C-alpha cells in the first residue's frame, strides 16, 4: 500500500498473509480474506506459481512476533475456472484456499463479511485497502499492516479512455487513482473494505495496478468485484 497509514491491530481481523516457503523461511507474497474458519479468498494470480503456501491469520507485523498469529497450511486451491493468467484484464481473478485446519476466531481473527450478490457501489464510496505490499512503486514490503483510504471510481469513469478504458470490466471494482494512495505489489489478493449501511464488507479482491506504477493518477487500483462471485464462492465451498 502506497500512501497508507499503519492499521490498528484489531481493525481488519479478516485480513490474512499468504506466504510461500522460501528456503528455510516463509515469504509474504499476497493478501487474502478469511471467509470461513477453513477458507480464504484471494486472487487467482497469487496462486499461479507452483509453490508451497501457508496462510497467517492474526498477523500484524510480518517481521516480529505479535502474539496473535495462527499459521495454517493450504490444503486445496480452487481457482476460478475461467481465470487465464495470460489475461488478467479478462477478470476472474479469484481463488479459494481450503486450509488444513480451522482457525480459532478472536478479536484478531474474524470472517470477512461479503456483500450481497449484485451490489454495486455508488461512485466515490468510502473504502479502505489493506495489506503488507510495497510502500512505494519499486519499493519494499511494509512490516506492519497498512491501510489507505481509496474511494471507489464507478465503471463509467473507470472504463473511460483516460482511466483504464477496455481493460476494466463490470466484474471489477476500481478505487483510488489520486496519484498518492494505492495498492501495490504484495497487496494482491487482499480486501477492499467498504462501509455500507454502517458495516464494512469486503467488496474487492485486489487484482492489478498500472504497469507504469502503483500510485498513478487516473489508474485506480483494480479489484475483482466480490459481489459478482457470491454464487461461485458458495458453490465451491458447498462442493468441498
Ligand atoms: Na507477526
Residue 125 CB neighbours (<10 A): 18
Q: How far is the CA of 143 from the centre of ligand 1 (A)?
A: 9
Q: Please pick, among 14, 17, 188, 227, the residue that the annotation labels catalytic.
A: 188
The number of residues making up the chain comes to 240
Query: Quick check: is 203 catalytic?
Result: no
Q: How far apart are CA 17 and CA 189, in angstroms?
A: 9
Structural fold of domain 1-12+112-227:
Thrombin, subunit H (2.40.10)
Q: How far apart are CA 229 and CA 231, in angstroms?
A: 6
Method used to obtain the model: X-ray
Sign of the Cα torsion 219, 8, 104, 234 reads negative
| 191-196, strands of its sheet edge to edge | 5-6, 146-149, 127-131, 191-196, 199-208, 221-225, 172-175, 152-153
Query: Quick check: is 193 catalytic?
Result: no
Q: How far apart are CA 203 and CA 70, in angstroms?
A: 25
Domain 13-111+228-240 in the same topology as domain 1-12+112-227: yes
Task: Report the half-sphere exposure of 78 (CA within 13 A, side-chain side).
Answer: 16
What's the CATH code, domain 13-111+228-240? 2.40.10.10
Range list of β-strands (E), 154-219? 172-175, 191-196, 199-208
Under 8 Å between Cβ of 185 and 207 = no
Q: How far apart are CA 46 and CA 183, in angstroms?
A: 15
Cell digits of residue 25: 523461511
Cell digits of residue 176: 483510488
Query: Domain-by-domain residue ranges, the chain?
Result: 1-12+112-227, 13-111+228-240
Q: How far apart are CA 226 and CA 212, in angstroms?
A: 26
Cα dihedral: 81, 82, 83, 89 (round 10): -160
Q: How far is the CA of 149 from the centre of ligand 1 (A)?
A: 24
Resolution in A: 1.1
Amino acid at each position: 500500500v502506497v500512501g497508507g497509514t499503519e492499521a490498528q491491530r484489531n481493525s481488519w481481523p479478516s485480513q490474512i498473509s499468504l506466504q510461500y516457503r522460501s528456503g528455510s523461511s516463509w515469504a509474504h507474497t499476497c493478501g487474502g480474506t478469511l471467509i470461513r474458519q477453513n477458507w480464504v479468498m484471494t486472487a487467482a494470480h497469487c496462486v499461479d506459481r507452483e509453490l508451497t503456501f501457508r496462510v497467517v491469520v492474526g498477523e500484524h507485523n510480518l517481521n516480529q512476533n505479535n502474539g496473535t498469529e495462527q499459521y495454517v497450511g493450504v490444503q486445496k486451491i480452487v481457482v476460478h475456472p475461467y481465470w487465464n493468467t495470460d489475461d488478467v484484464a479478462a477478470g476472474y481473478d479469484i481463488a479459494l484456499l481450503r486450509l488444513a485446519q480451522s482457525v480459532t476466531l478472536n478479536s484478531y481473527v474474524q470472517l470477512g463479511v461479503l456483500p450481497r450478490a449484485g451490489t454495486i457501489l455508488a461512485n466515490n464510496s468510502p473504502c479502505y485497502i489493506t495489506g503488507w505490499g510495497l510502500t512505494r512503486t519499486n519499493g519494499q514490503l511494509a512490516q506492519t499492516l497498512q491501510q489507505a483510504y481509496l474511494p471507489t471510481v464507478d465503471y463509467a469513469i473507470c472504463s473511460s479512455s483516460s482511466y483504464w478504458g477496455s481493460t476494466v470490466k463490470n466484474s471489477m471494482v476500481c478505487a483510488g487513482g489520486d496519484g498518492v494512495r494505492s495498492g501495490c505489489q504484495g497487496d494482491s489478493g487482499g480486501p477492499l473494505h467498504c462501509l455500507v449501511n454502517g458495516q464494512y464488507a469486503v467488496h474487492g479482491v485486489t487484482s492489478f495496478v498500472s504497469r507504469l506504477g502503483c500510485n498513478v493518477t487516473r489508474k485506480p487500483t483494480v479489484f475483482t468485484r466480490v459481489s459478482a462471485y457470491i454464487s461461485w464462492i458458495n458453490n465451491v465451498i458447498a462442493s468441498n
